[PDB]
Amino acid sequence: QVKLQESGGDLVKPGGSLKLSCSASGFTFSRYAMSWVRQTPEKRLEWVASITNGGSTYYSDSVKGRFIISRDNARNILSLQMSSLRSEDTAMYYCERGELTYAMDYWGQGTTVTVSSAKTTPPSVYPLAPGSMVTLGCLVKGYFPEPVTVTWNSGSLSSGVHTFPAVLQSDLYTLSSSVTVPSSTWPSETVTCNVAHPASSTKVDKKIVVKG
């Protein structure tokens, strides 16, 4: 199957530079045009750049002069280098097979980029244990910027989880995650909240333990 994995998203000061990578597999990469598309916090989809298989480049007027789209047909890697970054470049960035004319037929899951002068704050992570089925919680508080990645038992508990959109207060985000398991499985078996904050290069594991 065709797979596109983006990486390189980070917090960057305005005027700074950042390189995004897209690793392609499951198809002959050198035969296809490739594109980047961004999505703003307002959920507006916005084309960034495209590159033909021969290497001809096309850029949106929003990034002209500042962004470089490039490719390596030997490594099967699509790149985007962003220089002179602006606040307005803050967005989720997706890599696509194809381009605007004949359509973009496969999209990766994306990387987040935030352009801000504010420094990174890693989150504090707190377990939420209760005071047939049991719901447990994880509170991830006081971090900047988005995103955090929240999993339960390293992604083994997939169903019965709800991770809520972060709320911003006093220049810091806070989110919660709930997970619901059969009461015979907890506290009998381990349930742990795993939090990843790429911008501060932090990972936190917090076991949910009985008591309040």
């Binding site: 507006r44 084309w47 605007l100 359509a103 707190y126 509170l139 809520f164 959109p165 806070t174 309040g212």
Partner: protein, 215 residues
């Protein structure tokens, strides 16, 4: 300058209904290159319809697309729960934005009461001088739910922050978290903490509660 306008920006439909959404251009645009993408919550877009009328691989038969010139549409013949998503039209001739603003489709279901869970602040959180009392309201419908917090019987509004998930495309439900944040000192000056859930047509709230002294 040529813009793609999508209507309606937001639509709600019930399973089994036929739904149509439109994509209109400022000036004529070639049907050969008018495309549609579907984006589900927490996921990237997928190609849905290409060259006006052709379904991308794996896209259900109930989808169709029509149009030419300045006027295009996407139609679902019999909408299903899994169709909850935002739909975007796109054409290279459109500038400065190649994408339309999208149509967000909500899928109706019968009313469902939330599963409500209340949590006292993490004891470890208290060590920071802060106290977040958390209440989860999970898997309910419709979206417009009301949460009330009570401390020792009296309603409290200050320090409450609420967050809703997007509609679950599996079962058409919503979930939301309500967090009441107090100081460690304010929290320990009280015993009874209550999260109440109600909606417009409810005659009986769902109530979850704990006491600071005994669980």
């Amino acid at each position: 300058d040529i813009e793609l306008t999508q209507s309606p920006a937001i639509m709600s439909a019930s399973p089994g209904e036929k739904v149509t959404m439109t994509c209109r251009a400022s000036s004529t645009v070639s049907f050969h290159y008018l495309h549609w993408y579907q984006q589900k919550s927490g996921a990237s877009p997928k190609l849905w319809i290409y060259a006006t009328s052709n379904l991308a691989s794996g896209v259900p038969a109930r989808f169709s697309g029509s149009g030419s010139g300045t006027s295009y549409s996407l139609t679902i013949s019999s909408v299903e729960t899994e169709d909850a998503a935002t739909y975007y039209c796109q054409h290279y001739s459109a500038y400065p934005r190649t994408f339309g603003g999208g149509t967000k489709l909500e899928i109706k279901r019968a009313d469902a009461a939330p599963t409500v869970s209340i949590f006292p602040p993490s004891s470890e959180q208290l060590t920071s001088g802060g106290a977040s009392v958390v209440c989860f309201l999970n898997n309910f419908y419709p979206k417009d739910i009301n949460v009330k917090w009570k401390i020792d019987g009296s309603e409290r509004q200050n320090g409450v922050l609420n967050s809703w998930t997007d509609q679950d495309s599996k079962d058409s439900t919503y979930s939301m978290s309500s967090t009441l944040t107090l100081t460690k000192d304010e929290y320990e000056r009280h015993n009874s903490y209550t999260c109440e859930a109600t909606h417009k047509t409810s005659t009986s709230p769902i109530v979850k509660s704990f006491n600071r002294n005994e669980c």
